[PDB]
Amino acid sequence: GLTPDQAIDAIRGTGGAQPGCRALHAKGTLYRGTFTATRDAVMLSAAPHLDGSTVPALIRFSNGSGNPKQRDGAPGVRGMAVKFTLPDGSTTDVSAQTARLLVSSTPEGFIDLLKAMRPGLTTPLRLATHLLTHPRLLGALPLLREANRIPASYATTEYHGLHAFRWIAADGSARFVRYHLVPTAAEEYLSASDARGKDPDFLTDELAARLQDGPVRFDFRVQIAGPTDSTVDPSSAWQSTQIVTVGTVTITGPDTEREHGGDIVVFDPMRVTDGIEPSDDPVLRFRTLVYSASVKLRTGVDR
Ligand code: HEM
């Protein structure tokens, strides 16, 4: 179907894939913190970072746009990606953003919507046409709106991993889960009016001041799949309400140790670890390949 390079082309054609920048989620900042799982998390997965010990956590908050100069006050998706360092030095990532469900069940559908939302030219028509070709999306309009809200702070909105992951415990038991990173701070958003007058990078200024005041916390919750919940379609709503907090990410300040010299920081949803396996999700599988392409472009090195 769609190839990694074609995805990058589509992204570039919409304003992303800027020189030296992540093709998408170009604008973002790194923060330092730690993660500690609840005592029962070990019953769900044998992953080392979920055994109750405290591990290092690198967090990047970003704007989904491919434009590194994207204004924070403009409508748009926000991202929160976390990289956990394990005892043996290896790392595992959790990638999440503001939409509750993926707009499409396939990489092809996603890219088509990305292009339909390209220049402001005839966007209304292009989007309308896309919707007629993608009925399911047309029936969840409120979710598309929710995904592009303007948060008062990166710390005052929630993020979702969307894809299902298979969590396997030491006893060999397994369950499929979807990731949700929820703030302990009250959720808060800005009106179009208030957002309009904000500085272009008001979210990073806000977060810097917020952290100076004290740590920021996000609870890591997993939604456990129900009997008819699809483990392969991230655009499909789940009926399960079996959602449990498995840990907390405590962020204490901006990072200054990473992305210097030749250090490359990439949050890949496929970077799992023992006790966690990716589902047969086509978008999930496609992402690692597209990210490798995006990284190669911004760094020059490939993997
Ligand atoms: C098939 C569709 C998708 C494509 C083509 C895509 C592409 C990209 C690209 C090119 C980047 C910049 C990567 C880099 O250079 O490090 C990126 C970043 C990101 N993507 Fe996706 N993505 C897709 C779907 C998703 C989904 C469904 C999520 C939801 C969890 C997501 C969450 C993120 C996040 C959180 C980042 C931020 C990375 C950071 O701050 O370092 N992406 N994506």
From Swiss-Prot:
Does the keyword field hold Nucleotide-binding?
Answer: no
**Does the keyword section mention Oxidoreductase?**
yes
Q: Which residues form the active site?
A: 25
Which GO BP terms apply? hydrogen peroxide catabolic process; hydrogen peroxide metabolic process; regulation of reactive oxygen species metabolic process; response to hydrogen peroxide
Q: Which InterPro entries match?
A: Catalase, Catalase_core, Catalase_sf, Catalase_SrpA-type_pred
EC number in record: 1.11.1.-
CDD domains named among the record's database cross-references: srpA_like
| SMART domains linked | Catalase
Give one Pfam hit by family name.
Catalase
* Any one annotated GO CC term: cytoplasm
What does the annotation say about its assembly with partners?
Answer: Monomer.
Stated family: Belongs to the catalase family.
Q: What does this protein do?
A: Has an organic peroxide-dependent peroxidase activity. Exhibits strong peroxidase activity using organic hydroperoxides as cosubstrates, weak peroxidase activity using hydrogen peroxide and negligible catalase activity. May have a role in elimination of reactive oxygen species, in particular by deactivating hydroperoxides.
Instruction: Quote the protein name from its UniProt record.
Output: Catalase-related peroxidase
* Species in which this protein is naturally found: Mycolicibacterium paratuberculosis (strain ATCC BAA-968 / K-10)
